[PDB]
Amino acid sequence: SHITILTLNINGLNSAIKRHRLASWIKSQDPSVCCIQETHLTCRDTHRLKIKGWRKIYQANGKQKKAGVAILVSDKTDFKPTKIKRDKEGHYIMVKGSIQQEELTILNIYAPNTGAPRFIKQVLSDLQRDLDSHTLIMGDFNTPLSTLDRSTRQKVNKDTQELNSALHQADLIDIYRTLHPKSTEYTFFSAPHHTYSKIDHIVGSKALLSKCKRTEIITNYLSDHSAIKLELRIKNSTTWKLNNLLLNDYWVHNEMKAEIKMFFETNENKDTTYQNLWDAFKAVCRGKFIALNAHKRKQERSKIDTLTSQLKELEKQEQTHSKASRRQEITKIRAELKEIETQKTLQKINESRSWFFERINKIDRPLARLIKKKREKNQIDTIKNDKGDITTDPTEIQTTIREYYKHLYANKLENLEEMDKFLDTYTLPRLNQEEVESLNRPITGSEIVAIINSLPTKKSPGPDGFTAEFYQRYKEELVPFLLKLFQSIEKEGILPNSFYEASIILIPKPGRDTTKKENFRPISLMNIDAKILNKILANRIQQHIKKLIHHDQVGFIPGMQGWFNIRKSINVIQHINRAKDKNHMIISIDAEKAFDKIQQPFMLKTLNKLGIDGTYFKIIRAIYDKPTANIILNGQKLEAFPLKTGTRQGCPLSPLLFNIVLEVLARAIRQEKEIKGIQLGKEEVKLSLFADDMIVYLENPIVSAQNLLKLISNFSKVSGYKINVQKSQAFLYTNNRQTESQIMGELPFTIASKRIKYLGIQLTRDVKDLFKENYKPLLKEIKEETNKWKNIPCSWVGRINIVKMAILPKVIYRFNAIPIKLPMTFFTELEKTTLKFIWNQKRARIAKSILSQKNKAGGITLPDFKLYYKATVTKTAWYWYQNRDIDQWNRTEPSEIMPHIYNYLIFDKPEKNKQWGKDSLFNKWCWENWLAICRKLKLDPFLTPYTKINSRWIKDLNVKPKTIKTLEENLGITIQDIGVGKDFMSKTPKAMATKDKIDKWDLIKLKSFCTAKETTIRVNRQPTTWEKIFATYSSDKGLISRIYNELKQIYKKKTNNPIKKWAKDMNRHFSKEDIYAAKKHMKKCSSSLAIREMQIKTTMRYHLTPVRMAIIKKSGNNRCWRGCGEIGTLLHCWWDCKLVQPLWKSVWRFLRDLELEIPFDPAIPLLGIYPNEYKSCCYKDTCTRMFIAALFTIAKTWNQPKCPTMIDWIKKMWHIYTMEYYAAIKNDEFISFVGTWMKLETIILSKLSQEQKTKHRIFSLIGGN
RNA sequence: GCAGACUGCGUAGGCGUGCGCACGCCUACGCAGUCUGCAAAAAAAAAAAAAAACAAUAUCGGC
DNA sequence: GCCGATATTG
Ligand SMILES: Cc1cn([C@H]2C[C@H](O)[C@@H](COP(=O)(O)OP(=O)(O)OP(=O)(O)O)O2)c(=O)[nH]c1=O
């Protein structure tokens, strides 16, 4: 073990290309510590020095752009800083700390070029107290220490002798001279003097020499000065993870195909089982990927390799003898190396910039991680230990964590008889024979390939490096081998030993003290193939889960939505409020460390008791046979500690198995008649909640809660399911204070007299406070959450997407959970804050009406929270119409009236004089909203094509229910299928059969009703989209989106369109076709949202012109902000301005140079409204980019007397060109890109001179140079 | 010259209250009218994907 | 419809 410390005088870091190339070179050297001098960064520019892959970066920056220092410590180096001193001018930075329990004192110094020894001595006197036997003084000393440090071999000056004396008194020595007494190497070459000299030195105490390993001066072309690289011995491999980018090269892809094929053609035979063969293939592919990555790195910089080899040989020749022609050749080849490295670094940085440009403002990773605060460092370094100690020692903290989790997962409680007794007491659903054989059906390549295709991307790999992009890429050839492996696994029931491998990582629990070990959630990364097998099993069991779990559970269950329970719970609480005798309670049980306290033997026993037997259960038992988990703590893979209990918390199959296991407890609670839950109408609602979270409602708590605790204790004893009774709240209701007190006594639960947080919702003790506890906070939160974004660096489009991404999901979730009649003040406040954020505390530049309108209007669909609220509220009508027996949440309401009538009211008569209850919280408001929408559509909502066969019309025909059952089971469910008029029972042979099968009285009743003229006309008319939205769809997926789109269409205000105003001030009527074309162009002018944002801003008259400012300020100066002396109308500023005209004239010179005779029409560039006769999109693709570049050019200098120069337009065009080039290469759209850019590149290259393009880095990309 | 706030006029729908009318609230709505952040923009931001998984749900968009 | 991305609950 050695510590590599590197020092370098980079002579400024302003050049980004030089920054990264030093950052790429420093990556190659892999130093343990790096000291950098003359960063040319200010305290304001500390943001600039942000390098990926390195976190602990300490900076000392001066005010001016002359100095500034920083120290980089390798992530492989565990330096624990204690005290830091920084120079206000960057000449020095002090840092005291320890490395691996070895104290280390590091000093960085940049002495002035003149009189450095005196300045250094002053630093020594100031830091005399800080020097110890572990001192490292670094930086730019600006002086040589010995005669051998100068090429001229000139005597060390008297200042050096005094400086050396000062170092000697401080027991500090020149390490390089000590370790290389006879080395005459030098770091900097002085061109004016033609002399080499070693003026940067590594100085430390002699005691460190025993630790010192090796020091060397590494001549480099990245800077005039060479770095000194010292290795320091300390008292004594990471996991390989495949890189997605590696798969993008064709050569490596073909090589991997060939390697896979040759392996499975060579290593296949009878003597080996397919599991061990698969593991061997994994290892071989791992080694092959490592080797081919090395080969790819070699080839990619092979030119650099040969050039640096030539430089090494010629530099050795120079050192042994220096020659003038050798000097000039060395200089030329060094320039060649610089140009090649600049080429590669520009490639890399522009590829990154293109990636950002393609996602600059979209709702995507860049925006999501811009909005989110800087990630809190999950790398733990000190935790309140078991007894009382905070602790910091890495090995002791690792031991604490590892032992904690090893003890957590090492418990099976082998008491199978007790598990049998518990399971054979609460009869629970069993899968029929058909479903059993469905689970055990053979694995099909179609199934595996479907899983692979659905396999999430951009996900961390498991203990093996393969990252689920590897399987997708080699899907076509791997899938057969995966199928063979799964066939072997199902036949034999033994998994490859690599399947059990998993990597636990400790993610902090939000809102919890990270210093406690117990507050970390261990999430598991599993081998992707193991995850494929587990996803297969999870999908298999999921095909039958609906009948396997009661609808009380809505966590991890397809098609069930969490808000169900919320509404249910709230209804229950409302009932409690309305009850005369309030003797009841609700408890929010929260499982402690669920998925980890689950006992695998009990889970397997439950699955066996469920009828899951055979191949599927064999594989389930195998996957839990010998699971293992390594804890990747601080990047170190700790020991294995096989987890004897719990279910892997990152496994696809774990949620389903946990739900199945806890369904046993749910069934037990429901069966127990002495745990009587609240009774609403004709339904019993004992308990319902997400997977591990449970909420129970109980009557007569004194006894029911005690019985519940007894049952939970039995379940915990039998299965390990433990509840943290302390962190498990409850509302208690009793009409006697003494009863409340004694219940508090017996019950071990903490009674929350105000509220309970529950699925992100503040359930309120009294429902009347719901809003005050749920929306008023949320609204306030949004305000706060947006106030910290006041200065967020995003454009109005970026802010709109930020709202849509961060606030909208939160607001919609709140609406879904609590669709109570919200006062309009809430929506006014929410819209006000949202808009104010979007326009950063200024007046909205674009009309809210324009943006709110659909994307057809060219905008970005500024979300309308009022319409989202209405959509969410009216959504419940879908469940009303469906009348599902599982949505018990809907039927739990005040029962003043016959509660059964809710599935009605949708496409059936209104029960005039019949009230739904003043106490109704959700359904009454949904009814009001649904009626409002139906009235707005001016449709009849009581008899429609989708009226169910039995809602009230047939019922009001006093039809026997058996007749309704016959009609339902024969033909369909809607009146339409029955038919009306001529078509009554006259459209299918089954219709005739039913017509014959009904009794004469009911038959004639249906004849009288259906064939009536009014019903015929009201049922036959084609159904509107709003009705298909609640009848045609049998699934509630995407329902809010569809309802909101329909509402958007319905409530589409007639706004003051700004394209029409462009027509007006251009005195030229635009045809509807012209408006449509302008909107289409604004929609698809470019993929990147910066280009589209520019086009949208120009089209929507975003830029406020001197006319606007004159009117608002009432000042008469309408003169354009350029000295043009004309009126400052928008068309002037964009098109008609003598200072803006030359740019458009140049653009038209380019157009004609492109053999394009297009009219000199402002509409074409400013809006894309091409003349009707001109429709050749081939040239439009280029013209759009040319025009938008011109628009950017004008906008940048939108108000300066400065003329938008041609060169600015060229530069912006090339910016777009490079971004699109790399984006297309990554997206494989290269042919279209060349088609739309080749001629333009040719003209641009011809127009410019070599000097100008070189200065602006305008080297061609499509064509070689 | 865009928009919201907001005064008033007023259409219609609903809910609650009172004895066809009156009151209170809300919705959607057009009109006239006062403002009102204001320099001017491009700041560059980096904003970084890349590590920390899993199930389900919702949203958005592009194809 | 798919196919990416984001948040919501665990
Ligand atoms: C929050 C979260 C939960 N889960 C799963 C694993 C958990 O066992 C299960 C329930 O989570 P929670 O109930 O939210 O957490 P918990 O009950 O395990 O924590 P505590 O013991 O302190 O109450 O959901 C994840 O897989 N990933 C996650 O990020």
Author numbering: 6 to 241, 247 to 1275
Paper text:
New L1 insertions initiate by target-primed reverse transcription (TPRT), in which target-site nicking creates a primer for cDNA synthesis directly into the genome. We report cryo-electron microscopy structures of the complete human L1 ORF2p bound to structured template RNAs and initiating cDNA synthesis.
As cellular assays concur that L1 templates require a 3′ poly(A) tract, we used adenosine in the single-stranded region. Using this sample, we obtained the cryo-EM structure of the RNP in a paused elongation state at an overall resolution of 3.2 Å. This resolution enabled us to model the entire protein chain and the individual nucleotides, including a dTTP bound as a nucleotide substrate but unable to join the cDNA 3′ end. The incoming dTTP and the dideoxy-guanosine at the primer 3′ end (ddG-13) are positioned by the canonical FADD active-site motif and by the conserved aromatic residues Phe566 and Phe605. The incoming dTTP hydrogen bonds with three RT domain residues, including the Arg531 side chain. The array of protein–RNA interactions bends the template RNA to follow an L-shaped architecture. Notably, our structure captures the CTS domain forcing apart the RNA stem-loop strands at the base of the stem through the steric barrier defined by an α-helix (hereafter, termed insertion helix), which forks the RNA stem. In the structure, the first three stem base pairs are splayed apart concurrent with Ile1121 and Ile1122 of the insertion helix forming hydrophobic interactions with the splayed bases G-1 and C-46 (Ile1121 and Ile1122), G-45 and U-44 (Ile1122).
